[PDB]
Nucleic acid binder design. Structure first.
Ligand SMILES: [Mg+2]
Ligand SMILES: [Mg+2]
Ligand SMILES: [Mg+2]
Ligand SMILES: [Mg+2]
Ligand SMILES: [Mg+2]
Ligand SMILES: [Mg+2]
Ligand SMILES: [Mg+2]
Ligand SMILES: [Mg+2]
Ligand SMILES: [Mg+2]
Ligand SMILES: [Mg+2]
Ligand SMILES: [Mg+2]
Ligand SMILES: [Mg+2]
Ligand SMILES: [Mg+2]
Ligand SMILES: [Mg+2]
Ligand SMILES: [Mg+2]
Ligand SMILES: [Mg+2]
Ligand SMILES: [Mg+2]
Ligand SMILES: [Mg+2]
Ligand SMILES: [Mg+2]
Ligand SMILES: [Mg+2]
Ligand SMILES: [Mg+2]
Ligand SMILES: [Mg+2]
Ligand SMILES: [Mg+2]
Ligand SMILES: [Mg+2]
Ligand SMILES: [Mg+2]
Ligand SMILES: [Mg+2]
Ligand SMILES: [Mg+2]
Ligand SMILES: [Mg+2]
Ligand SMILES: [Mg+2]
Ligand SMILES: [Mg+2]
Ligand SMILES: [Mg+2]
Ligand SMILES: [Mg+2]
Ligand SMILES: [Mg+2]
Ligand SMILES: [Mg+2]
Ligand SMILES: [Mg+2]
Ligand SMILES: [Mg+2]
Ligand SMILES: [Mg+2]
Ligand SMILES: [Mg+2]
Ligand SMILES: [Mg+2]
Ligand SMILES: [Mg+2]
Ligand SMILES: [Mg+2]
Ligand SMILES: [Mg+2]
Ligand SMILES: [Mg+2]
Ligand SMILES: [Mg+2]
Ligand SMILES: [Mg+2]
Ligand SMILES: [Mg+2]
Ligand SMILES: [Mg+2]
Ligand SMILES: [Mg+2]
Ligand SMILES: [Mg+2]
Ligand SMILES: [Mg+2]
Ligand SMILES: [Mg+2]
Ligand SMILES: [Mg+2]
Ligand SMILES: [Mg+2]
Ligand SMILES: [Mg+2]
Ligand SMILES: [Mg+2]
Ligand SMILES: [Mg+2]
Ligand SMILES: [Mg+2]
Ligand SMILES: [Mg+2]
Ligand SMILES: [Mg+2]
Ligand SMILES: [Mg+2]
Ligand SMILES: [Mg+2]
Ligand SMILES: [Mg+2]
Ligand SMILES: [Mg+2]
Ligand SMILES: [Mg+2]
Ligand SMILES: [Mg+2]
Ligand SMILES: [Mg+2]
Ligand SMILES: [Mg+2]
Ligand SMILES: [Mg+2]
Ligand SMILES: [Mg+2]
Ligand SMILES: [Mg+2]
Ligand SMILES: [Mg+2]
Ligand SMILES: [Mg+2]
Ligand SMILES: [Mg+2]
Ligand SMILES: [Mg+2]
Ligand SMILES: [Mg+2]
Ligand SMILES: [Mg+2]
Ligand SMILES: [Mg+2]
Ligand SMILES: [Mg+2]
Ligand SMILES: [Mg+2]
Ligand SMILES: [Mg+2]
Ligand SMILES: [Mg+2]
Ligand SMILES: [Mg+2]
Ligand SMILES: [Mg+2]
Ligand SMILES: [Mg+2]
Ligand SMILES: [Mg+2]
Ligand SMILES: [Mg+2]
Ligand SMILES: [Mg+2]
Ligand SMILES: [Mg+2]
Ligand SMILES: [Mg+2]
Ligand SMILES: [Mg+2]
Ligand SMILES: [Mg+2]
Ligand SMILES: [Mg+2]
Ligand SMILES: [Mg+2]
Ligand SMILES: [Mg+2]
Ligand SMILES: [Mg+2]
Ligand SMILES: [Mg+2]
Ligand SMILES: [Mg+2]
Ligand SMILES: [Mg+2]
Ligand SMILES: [Mg+2]
Ligand SMILES: [Mg+2]
Ligand SMILES: [Mg+2]
Ligand SMILES: [Mg+2]
Ligand SMILES: [Mg+2]
Ligand SMILES: [Mg+2]
Ligand SMILES: [Mg+2]
Ligand SMILES: [Mg+2]
Ligand SMILES: [Mg+2]
Ligand SMILES: [Mg+2]
Ligand SMILES: [Mg+2]
Ligand SMILES: [Mg+2]
Ligand SMILES: [Mg+2]
Ligand SMILES: [Mg+2]
Ligand SMILES: [Mg+2]
Ligand SMILES: [Mg+2]
Ligand SMILES: [Mg+2]
Ligand SMILES: [Mg+2]
Ligand SMILES: [Mg+2]
Ligand SMILES: [Mg+2]
Ligand SMILES: [Mg+2]
Ligand SMILES: [Mg+2]
Ligand SMILES: [Mg+2]
Ligand SMILES: [Mg+2]
Ligand SMILES: [Mg+2]
Ligand SMILES: [Mg+2]
Ligand SMILES: [Mg+2]
Ligand SMILES: [Mg+2]
Ligand SMILES: [Mg+2]
Ligand SMILES: [Mg+2]
Ligand SMILES: [Mg+2]
Ligand SMILES: [Mg+2]
Ligand SMILES: [Mg+2]
Ligand SMILES: [Mg+2]
Ligand SMILES: [Mg+2]
Ligand SMILES: [Mg+2]
Ligand SMILES: [Mg+2]
Ligand SMILES: [Mg+2]
Ligand SMILES: [Mg+2]
Ligand SMILES: [Mg+2]
Ligand SMILES: [Mg+2]
Ligand SMILES: [Mg+2]
Ligand SMILES: [Mg+2]
Ligand SMILES: [Mg+2]
Ligand SMILES: [Mg+2]
Ligand SMILES: [Mg+2]
Ligand SMILES: [Mg+2]
Ligand SMILES: [Mg+2]
Ligand SMILES: [Mg+2]
Ligand SMILES: [Mg+2]
Ligand SMILES: [Mg+2]
Ligand SMILES: [Mg+2]
Ligand SMILES: [Mg+2]
Ligand SMILES: [Mg+2]
Ligand SMILES: [Mg+2]
Ligand SMILES: [Mg+2]
Ligand SMILES: [Mg+2]
Lengths: 51, 100, 63
RNA sequence: UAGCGGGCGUGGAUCCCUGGAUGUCCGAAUGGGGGAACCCGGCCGGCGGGAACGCCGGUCACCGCGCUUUUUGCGCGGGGGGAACCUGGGGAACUGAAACAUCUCAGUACCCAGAGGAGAGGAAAGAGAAAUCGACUCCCUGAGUAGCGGCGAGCGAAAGGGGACCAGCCUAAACCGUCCGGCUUGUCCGGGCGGGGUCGUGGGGCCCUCGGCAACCGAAUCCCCAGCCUAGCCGAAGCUGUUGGGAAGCAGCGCCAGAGAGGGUGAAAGCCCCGUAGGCGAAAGGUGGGGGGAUAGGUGAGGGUACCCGAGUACCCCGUGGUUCGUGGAGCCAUGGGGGAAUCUGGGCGGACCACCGCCUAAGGCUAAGUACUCCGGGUGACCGAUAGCGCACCAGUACCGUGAGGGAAAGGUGAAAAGAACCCCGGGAGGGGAGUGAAAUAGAGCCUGAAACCGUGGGCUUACAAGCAGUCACGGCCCCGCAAGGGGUUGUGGCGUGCCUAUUGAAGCAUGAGCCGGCGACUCACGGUCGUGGGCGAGCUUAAGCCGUUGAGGCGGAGGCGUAGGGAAACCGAG
């Protein structure tokens, strides 16, 4: 537990954490999520753990 | 089975090595070794004759087979990948946008 | 694998709460005859070991 | 698997899948014999002129079971094999106990018989203390506990609790009918068949009273189907320049992505090729309760009477085996010997025996699942990479060795492509020298890389008055590097100097081991302890099997364990 929390925390204190819901890029198609990515500032510059 | 590949006795572009760009009809497809002979990769076999019969056999610099990967089919354009597609019955390979 | 307690030990020794080890005094079932009444009164009290206390303890552990 | 020499394919060959056909002789081997692969027949039919001879087709072993009139026949089945797993019948020793005999190793190794995709076990004559549990198997726990033990070495349960799986059935007997055999005609003697019956709130039989059942259940048996297995198919996206022997690299612009797993292509490719994600497919065989359908079966309440409820059995005793139990207070389960009942007012059990209170119904059989294993197929590795990894990457259980059982190797690599070197020259040939191919030939054919020992050619320094663990220190000469101070090689004289390892009180030792080089080669892991140490939590801490996820994601799961109280052999008492 502690680890899990601390990890999520570390990446929050860092600023990198981001919650969302506005997944308009639904419909399983890479190009769509790729479009939603840009809008959300996920330029693909950095690795992402999409949960 | 499975030994099948790109294409057969017809027209093709050599995107290979030394004979890159060159283009012509493939005179033979070797499915076992996975090669094809076109009009490229000509090589001089200094050797006399190729068999225990007949006198002079000549330095016949005939074509050496190519890895079937280095040749690509072609039709009203320039090197289009193959795409199979069926009609109301049988089946024939339309090129990347055209036919045959 | 999985150490077995030494039954021979358990049948004649105890670990005290502090980690000591005790047992009855020897020599009181035979030599008896008229040894000073004092002797046998003192062969009744149990005692603690010393170094074999450690040898002894190892032979237990689940205990 | 090239070549000589000939053929076939879109009237869709080759190839892959299913089914069928043919299948010499040996082998359970089965007409008989035999030194496996050979030899010789009987009977029916066929072939040759075919009586003699030969060939061809069919048939003829033995055992068990059931019909068959004893007779000869007919039908069904058995026989042998299988890596490991399984059951039963037999059953060691080294070893441990620091000797050794009880004991241990161990019901292990092994021999034998048998079973099957499993085998065993299995619906309580159970457990054992709760007036409780409810077939069997498997995992976790209980537990290194209870106990066992030359109380030595050591061995080592069960109830219970948490899980996986889940399922319950058929008969024998009393009673009635029938068939055949029997007598001394009896609801009678035996045998076979059918009906009846099947359990511990004890049940069933036969009699009296109520349905005189539609119904309700229903398979482990059949039938249909889905699904799956044995071939396959579809599958997105790239061009140009540049270096090069060869782009997949570098550069310029661009695209796909439910696909940026992997492999190949002359090097380093999502978009070149095979694939991958994601979807599609069976005429034929195999599988197939998961779904559907049918059949076999299956069931109610009181009263009466005492018919039945598994025999050389229970039971007792002698001899033993099993269990944690080694004769122990020694039960329980099994049984070689002797004696030897009862049918519920009957019997077994709850650790000698007795009483009490309870549990369970022996002496017939069957039963899926959860479990074990891996010859075979597939997937994956903080698995090997040719002295490794299987003994075997290669024509290996081979060569070779042994009468035999049996033992048992070595051995992988040209290049991107044979382009495998025509032709000329010396040579009998081998092998070379040119020419030629290639990016490379010192990649030239047991050909990548090519280390060391070992052999040789050339060059520098050095040596024929010299005494040695072969070196080190100093100076000098010669040769070579750099303009230089300097450095490298060599060694003339001088000084100094008892190999390495091992074993020892002590080794240069005339004590051990080593010809030299290269490669292989020895303190590990599992579980349980005990300290230390890094962290999490704290009078608390932690889960095990398993379940749910996932397919290099984790969560759930408190049964259980350690701790919070000690002292006593114990009853017991309690900060004592
Ligand atoms: Mg394409
Ligand atoms: Mg005593
Ligand atoms: Mg005296
Ligand atoms: Mg051939
Ligand atoms: Mg022809
Ligand atoms: Mg066939
Ligand atoms: Mg055959
Ligand atoms: Mg035969
Ligand atoms: Mg025979
Ligand atoms: Mg025979
Ligand atoms: Mg004639
Ligand atoms: Mg004749
Ligand atoms: Mg016959
Ligand atoms: Mg016989
Ligand atoms: Mg017999
Ligand atoms: Mg017999
Ligand atoms: Mg007969
Ligand atoms: Mg018959
Ligand atoms: Mg039959
Ligand atoms: Mg057999
Ligand atoms: Mg035996
Ligand atoms: Mg012995
Ligand atoms: Mg002995
Ligand atoms: Mg011994
Ligand atoms: Mg030992
Ligand atoms: Mg010894
Ligand atoms: Mg001895
Ligand atoms: Mg003894
Ligand atoms: Mg034993
Ligand atoms: Mg046993
Ligand atoms: Mg046995
Ligand atoms: Mg069996
Ligand atoms: Mg199974
Ligand atoms: Mg079974
Ligand atoms: Mg059975
Ligand atoms: Mg019951
Ligand atoms: Mg008891
Ligand atoms: Mg109850
Ligand atoms: Mg119980
Ligand atoms: Mg229970
Ligand atoms: Mg366990
Ligand atoms: Mg004793
Ligand atoms: Mg034992
Ligand atoms: Mg239990
Ligand atoms: Mg509980
Ligand atoms: Mg249970
Ligand atoms: Mg009977
Ligand atoms: Mg009867
Ligand atoms: Mg009758
Ligand atoms: Mg009768
Ligand atoms: Mg009859
Ligand atoms: Mg009669
Ligand atoms: Mg009768
Ligand atoms: Mg009957
Ligand atoms: Mg019945
Ligand atoms: Mg019946
Ligand atoms: Mg009944
Ligand atoms: Mg009456
Ligand atoms: Mg009635
Ligand atoms: Mg009635
Ligand atoms: Mg009716
Ligand atoms: Mg279905
Ligand atoms: Mg299925
Ligand atoms: Mg298939
Ligand atoms: Mg395709
Ligand atoms: Mg593609
Ligand atoms: Mg240039
Ligand atoms: Mg280049
Ligand atoms: Mg260029
Ligand atoms: Mg390029
Ligand atoms: Mg553009
Ligand atoms: Mg898609
Ligand atoms: Mg790269
Ligand atoms: Mg690639
Ligand atoms: Mg199919
Ligand atoms: Mg079909
Ligand atoms: Mg089918
Ligand atoms: Mg099949
Ligand atoms: Mg079938
Ligand atoms: Mg099933
Ligand atoms: Mg019907
Ligand atoms: Mg009823
Ligand atoms: Mg009554
Ligand atoms: Mg009454
Ligand atoms: Mg009456
Ligand atoms: Mg009465
Ligand atoms: Mg009565
Ligand atoms: Mg009976
Ligand atoms: Mg008997
Ligand atoms: Mg004894
Ligand atoms: Mg014993
Ligand atoms: Mg008992
Ligand atoms: Mg007996
Ligand atoms: Mg009676
Ligand atoms: Mg009476
Ligand atoms: Mg008994
Ligand atoms: Mg009992
Ligand atoms: Mg008794
Ligand atoms: Mg009992
Ligand atoms: Mg008792
Ligand atoms: Mg009781
Ligand atoms: Mg009982
Ligand atoms: Mg019973
Ligand atoms: Mg019987
Ligand atoms: Mg029974
Ligand atoms: Mg009997
Ligand atoms: Mg069975
Ligand atoms: Mg295993
Ligand atoms: Mg294995
Ligand atoms: Mg396998
Ligand atoms: Mg495998
Ligand atoms: Mg490696
Ligand atoms: Mg080798
Ligand atoms: Mg090598
Ligand atoms: Mg070997
Ligand atoms: Mg081989
Ligand atoms: Mg040999
Ligand atoms: Mg050998
Ligand atoms: Mg070759
Ligand atoms: Mg030459
Ligand atoms: Mg000659
Ligand atoms: Mg030559
Ligand atoms: Mg040359
Ligand atoms: Mg050249
Ligand atoms: Mg080079
Ligand atoms: Mg050259
Ligand atoms: Mg070289
Ligand atoms: Mg080379
Ligand atoms: Mg050679
Ligand atoms: Mg060589
Ligand atoms: Mg290479
Ligand atoms: Mg050398
Ligand atoms: Mg020299
Ligand atoms: Mg000189
Ligand atoms: Mg000298
Ligand atoms: Mg001297
Ligand atoms: Mg010089
Ligand atoms: Mg200079
Ligand atoms: Mg010197
Ligand atoms: Mg000296
Ligand atoms: Mg000295
Ligand atoms: Mg050494
Ligand atoms: Mg010497
Ligand atoms: Mg000596
Ligand atoms: Mg010695
Ligand atoms: Mg020596
Ligand atoms: Mg030595
Ligand atoms: Mg030697
Ligand atoms: Mg160690
Ligand atoms: Mg430790
Ligand atoms: Mg701590
Ligand atoms: Mg926990
Ligand atoms: Mg709970
Ligand atoms: Mg609970
Ligand atoms: Mg005490």
């Amino acid at each position: 537990k502690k680890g899990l929390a601390m990890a999520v925390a570390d990446r929050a204190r860092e600023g990198k954490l981001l919650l969302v819901e506005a997944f308009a890029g639904v419909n399983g198609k890479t190009k769509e999520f790729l479009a939603w990515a840009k809008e959300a500032g996920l330029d693909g510059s950095e690795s992402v753990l999409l949960v | 089975r499975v030994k099948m590949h790109v294409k057969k006795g017809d027209t093709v572009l050599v995107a290979s090595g030394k004979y890159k760009g060159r283009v012509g009809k493939v005179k033979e497809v070797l499915p076992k070794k996975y090669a094809v002979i076109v009009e490229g990769v000509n090589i001089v076999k200094k050797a006399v004759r190729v068999s225990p019969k007949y006198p002079q056999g000549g330095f016949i610099e005939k074509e050496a087979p190519l890895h079937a990967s280095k040749v690509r089919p072609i039709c009203p354009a320039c090197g289009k990948p193959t795409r199979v597609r069926k009609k109301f019955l049988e089946n024939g390979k339309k090129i990347r946008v055209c036919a045959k | 694998p999985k150490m077995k307690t030494h039954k021979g030990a358990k049948k004649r020794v105890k670990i005290t709460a502090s980690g000591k080890v005790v047992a009855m005094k020897t020599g009181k079932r035979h030599l008896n005859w008229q040894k000073s009444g004092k002797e046998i009164r003192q062969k009744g009290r149990k005692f603690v070991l010393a170094k074999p206390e450690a040898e002894r303890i190892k032979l237990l552990l689940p205990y």
